[PDB]
Amino acid sequence: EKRSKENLPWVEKYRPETLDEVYGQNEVITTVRKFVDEGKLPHLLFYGPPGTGKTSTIVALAREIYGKNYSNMVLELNASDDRGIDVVRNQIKDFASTRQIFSKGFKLIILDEADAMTNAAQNALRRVIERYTKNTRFCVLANYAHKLTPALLSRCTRFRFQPLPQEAIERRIANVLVHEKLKLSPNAEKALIELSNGDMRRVLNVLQSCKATLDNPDEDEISDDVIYECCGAPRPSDLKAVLKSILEDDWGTAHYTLNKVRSAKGLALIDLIEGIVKILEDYELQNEETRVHLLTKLADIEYSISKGGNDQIQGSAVIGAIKASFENET
Amino acid sequence: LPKMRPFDRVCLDIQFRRPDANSIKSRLMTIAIREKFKLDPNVIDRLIQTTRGDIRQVINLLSTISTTTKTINHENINEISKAWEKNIALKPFDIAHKMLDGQIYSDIGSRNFTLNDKIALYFDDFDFTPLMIQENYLSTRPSVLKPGQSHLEAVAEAANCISLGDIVEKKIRSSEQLWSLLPLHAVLSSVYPASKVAGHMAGRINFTAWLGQNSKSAKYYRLLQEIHYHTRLGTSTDKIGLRLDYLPTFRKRLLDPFLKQGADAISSVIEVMDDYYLTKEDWDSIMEFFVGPDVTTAIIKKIPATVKSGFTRKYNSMTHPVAIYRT
Amino acid sequence: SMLEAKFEEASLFKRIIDGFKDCVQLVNFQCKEDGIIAQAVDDSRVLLVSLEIGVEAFQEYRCDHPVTLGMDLTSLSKILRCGNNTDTLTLIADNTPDSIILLFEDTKKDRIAEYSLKLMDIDADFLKIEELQYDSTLSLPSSEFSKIVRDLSQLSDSINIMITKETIKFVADGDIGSGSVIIKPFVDMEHPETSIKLEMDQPVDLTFGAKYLLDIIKGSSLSDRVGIRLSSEAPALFQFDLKSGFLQFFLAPKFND
Amino acid sequence: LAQQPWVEKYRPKNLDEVTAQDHAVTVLKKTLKSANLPHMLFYGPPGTGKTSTILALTKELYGPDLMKSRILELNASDERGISIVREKVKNFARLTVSKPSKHDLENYPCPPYKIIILDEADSMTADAQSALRRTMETYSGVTRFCLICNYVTRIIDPLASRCSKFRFKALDASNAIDRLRFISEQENVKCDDGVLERILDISAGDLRRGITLLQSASKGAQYLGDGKNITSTQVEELAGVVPHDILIEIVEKVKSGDFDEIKKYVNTFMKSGWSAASVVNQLHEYYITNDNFDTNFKNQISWLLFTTDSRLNNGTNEHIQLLNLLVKISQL
Amino acid sequence: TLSLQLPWVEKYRPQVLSDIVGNKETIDRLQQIAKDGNMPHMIISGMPGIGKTTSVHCLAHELLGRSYADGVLELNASDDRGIDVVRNQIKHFAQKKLHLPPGKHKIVILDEADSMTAGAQQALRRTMELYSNSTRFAFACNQSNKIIEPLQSRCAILRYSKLSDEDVLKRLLQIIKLEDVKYTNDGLEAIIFTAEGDMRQAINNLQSTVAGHGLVNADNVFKIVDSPHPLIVKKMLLASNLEDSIQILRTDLWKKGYSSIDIVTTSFRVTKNLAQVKESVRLEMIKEIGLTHMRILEGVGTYLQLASMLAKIHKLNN
DNA sequence: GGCCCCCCCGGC
């Protein structure tokens, strides 16, 4: 890095350095701590969605096992590096079959993002794993399990990283506020959690954007309005009004309301559709085909939007689909 | 295999067939007697049916089974036959014949030949199976037609599924290289379309003709491009426009006057060629494009040989301009 | 300039650069008043190369403050090849440098070549890895070591070194056969350069890869004698002494099982 | 200069010329004094000012001297395969920052990192994208990444999570009129009231198209040499907008319901060269905004228009799609 | 804190053919061949983690006694197995002169032979045929279709079956008694249920439990080992009502961190292997799942697409 | 010993 850590992005500035700074994975953290505290550390397969803390967890585990000079005693290979059949055959085999250099210890290999590896390399790694197990251990981090061969999966103990719970995100937010001397309104916190979807990177990015948006962070408190302005996401009140107008009001006034709501803050149609879907998922419908039509038509509209096209036609289609689906209620 | 093509007519071809169950009965009984294990003759044929003409494989089977089991009778023949079944990938013709059979798609057949089995059959040769299915799905007598459904409706549904499978295949071989969709292409190209017209073939199975048509179309496009870039300096149009609109008018000037004035139209044809930088090979290519009732093969053949010889001599007796240099 | 190091001959630096370019890729140089040090770790994390060049190897050397320079050995070798073998080479660097300047000057003519290599951000420490008291030490001509390594690498990819009472044994076990070479220490007073010396504290038996030894013996062109130091639970040391500095290869022995 | 198109001549040079993207421009300006710029992912509809915004930010951050040595820009016109990403991008990111000169350190903030701008990132393959995940994280302290795309769904989830998302809003008459008016005054273009608003409405969130239309109208007025103010009819003619009379005839033919008459009228209409997308948009506006139709008719026509637009967006024949849409509407 | 303990998979790896559970007939046949000698060329096929490599290693060790080092040539996917290697090193080993007991032969163990190229397999044919009096070949593969027909003709076939619940349970009791592990019946049942016949996974789960919680029960096993997602996908696809399927997808799949691509792939496989459903209905569901998969691969990996796919499947099956 | 070039799979 350059200068100091204050110039780093919040996503990288607040990267955990030890295992006790990882939140939302109490079971996995306790299990790995117990494993590394009594010498029985098996091969690990950390499977989870982005932003859960798998890389941070493995880095902290390596630091605890080896210490400050852990970078020179582990072999970290990721998608950014070339990992082919020849690499597995030569470099990984040599690392697993050779003693340590700086200090006595066992060999650790971290194959981050191994789901992007070829099948030949995965097949080759089987005997490398099963032959040098006495002095070497393997850790594989993945987001999609279908990319891993069954043979590789059989040789690794599986640990699943769940989406971050609400309390963990609140604790991390409180720590960040304490470090940055910032104040957050409770409604702003709830909106941040709602839009976070269990990813801490989104929390940090949105919080940094909100801090940058404030006129003076020293004596300004971030509110839900600030978060909505920074992210441009529709407000819940706007979504409720749009849904109400679509459901009860006629075509002309519903179209006018949708246009006015979208043009007031430059809202995007996809976010409105997502919010309407979330709101309607809790509706106690009396018929099934109505829900079927809603889901199918909204998925079609989302797919069409993903490829671009006329936005006004897409909004009219959304309104018409909702009206037609709710017509079946009778 | 195509690699054997050079050996087509340079060696005496000797073909060996799978030995019958009666040509090896005596040898196998002698082996059983010598090795002191009982081998019931009545179950011998199944062994060959299990090994499918492989004497070495059946000998190895006997050697392995006799290690701990000294009796080979009908009580355990089924187990060994099931355990030692040989799996060989079917050829494209065999794949098409089996996939277009209505027995496997019935309620009873489906429990024996499952969907996974059909997908594996497709995967035995995934580069030919869709073509064979698309070629041979119009020559069947379906036996799985739904009550009230006609053959034409099933054919239309199969064609729609084939089009969807073609779209999937195009997406598979794109820059993204989405090969994980190959199993889906198995259903949309081979299994599903065959499931609607499954039955008995109405005739011999024909190999796909799409490859030859594609090669011919590529050659025709190459000749059309050559002609278009040879006449680019004179015409204001593209190759598609040249083929659709210009070629009939050109025929009206480069072929018609040979059929009326005889050998006196050579000068005009040569003048047209010079004006449009056309050559004799370009003439042949252009006259070969026409289809329908405007075929020129018979007309060209009926032209007197003297006229053609004079035209060739005139063309070769003078200099002509060249449009593109070092083509 | 802040750091200015003048070489008597560009070949002097070129030969040392070529001595370990085929085993490591990224290099880090620390330049101070005492001299220039560098340590490189290969991708497999098996071999470590430690080079030190003193001020006596430079015509004019000046370094006000320590300088850390990260470079790619391939790029440096390419730039050195671009230079000639008869010009004067000058290393030039400034405060917080973003690049290193190699100056090639010809005395016969008025031609000056100034090449600039962009520096690399490699944050790492040295850790001064060196065992205080090795189990055994020995010194022998580099040519003999290279010959033995090349002969025993043709039979197998692994070589075992045994140090025992007044004898050193190199053993290779392969598919086509096996080979053994035994050498006993002796002193010659008329060709001291050909003598072999050995001082042992405990017997040693360590296995190493053939490829790493083949790459290590490539530095035989920088010295006439090589010192091999072996110690249990410690990397094997291969030292080639230079005119005023030295080069060292630390090789981790293979796991025994 | 006078030898450049108005779209390029009036391209923003600094961050103060951005009109309707304040929600992100304010954050970018604050990053100048905060010096903690994160990885950015700029997404939005075409012609919103993303590349211009990033260029202005890089200029204001580094200066014309350090721009070349601190910026690495890769777009769809360069090979960006997995090998390129793994070698060139990795090497540039891992390099040290260029040493600023006292002049630059005096007149510019000179942040201690370099910027890699991956424009048109939506065209990169998933395998190539996956190679940057650790590259951005490892060298975040010396390098920052800017990914510009039009379809946010084309970016893999890990990269979107790593990057801070910035959505560029559409430029309509309510937020981009000031820039168009300023350009008109600078070029001394005389227009009637509502002409600029009509241009922006026709553009539908594309300021580049509006500027091009204004330039074409100004050229036509200058060639006319009459001095009269530019009207809206000429602007509509230059924008390919179907006349209202033709639309009235189209809807009357649709109401007639006869297949042969509709087919003949469509055949005659397609010889004028009108774009199918404009016709569909005008028909949608007319039918949706009309109060002479019931709920069911609008419900069906909305889906019909959506399907027709989706099919047309895939690059199909306009004649067949238009005829099918008109036939379907006539049977509603 | 750097002294690793040998995992139970390697610590309790069988060293004799009598310690291998499952496939009784094949194990007794191998024991009889080892006792009587004359080991023929063999190809052993089966799913991962059932004891093929262990079986071949034990057979070779028992057959060759102290001559294992000089009489066994082991090559796997982690070593170079090109055409040149087969043509030179394997030929040299086969032609090697090694004095052995009268009933023994040299052994070549080509593990994971399914990854070998066609050229090497073709070149091996006459190598096995000519030198069958001194050298014998034992291949271990996961997919038997990747081996060329001539090699299968020259070799016996040993298709390992799936380990029964009783055999895995018995091995678990033996290992627990050896390690003195406190266990409960429900915990062992859960471990076997999650193993799905994979002994290696069962051993890994049994070690992770006790290594992390001490005592084995259903809760302890389930809090670290998740139920196989294919079963949850099958349950979701077989839901009587759309609401139940949506709830299952939201609670057990989406909120647990599973990716949409994995969910759609698992749904594809489950629909591929659903016997209770009619073939035509299965084909329609496969078509819908393929449409959803194509949509997801383009970038729209949203829960909305999965919900729409479930709704369409329910509509089709109505 | 190192490029450079040509042919061939790619799902479970």
Ligand SMILES: Nc1ncnc2c1ncn2[C@@H]1O[C@H](COP(=O)(O)OP(=O)(O)OP(O)(O)=S)[C@@H](O)[C@H]1O
């Ligand atoms: N459990 C966590 N506790 C605190 N911060 C977290 C946690 N998980 C993620 N983060 C934060 O998000 C940043 C990125 O976390 P990562 O370790 O990169 O997630 P990841 O699971 O490795 O992403 P993938 O699966 O490789 S795309 C960290 O530097 C942390 O600042």
Ligand SMILES: Nc1ncnc2c1ncn2[C@@H]1O[C@H](COP(=O)(O)OP(=O)(O)OP(O)(O)=S)[C@@H](O)[C@H]1O
């Ligand atoms: N926010 C804006 N402010 C002023 N002018 C703009 C703005 N956005 C676009 N323009 C004008 O339109 C021209 C083109 O803008 P662009 O930067 O190319 O838009 P864009 O977002 O990069 O389009 P895409 O998504 O790459 S096709 C600029 O030179 C400006 O003259």
Ligand SMILES: Nc1ncnc2c1ncn2[C@@H]1O[C@H](COP(=O)(O)OP(=O)(O)OP(O)(O)=S)[C@@H](O)[C@H]1O
């Ligand atoms: N029949 C078995 N009896 C006892 N333990 C077994 C058995 N099979 C597998 N194991 C155990 O699981 C471990 C691994 O067995 P393996 O021999 O590697 O299975 P495998 O079928 O050869 O795996 P593949 O197909 O090469 S991925 C053994 O060391 C044993 O501890």
Ligand SMILES: [Mg+2]
């Ligand atoms: Mg990570």
Ligand SMILES: [Mg+2]
């Ligand atoms: Mg742009």
Ligand SMILES: [Mg+2]
């Ligand atoms: Mg195995």
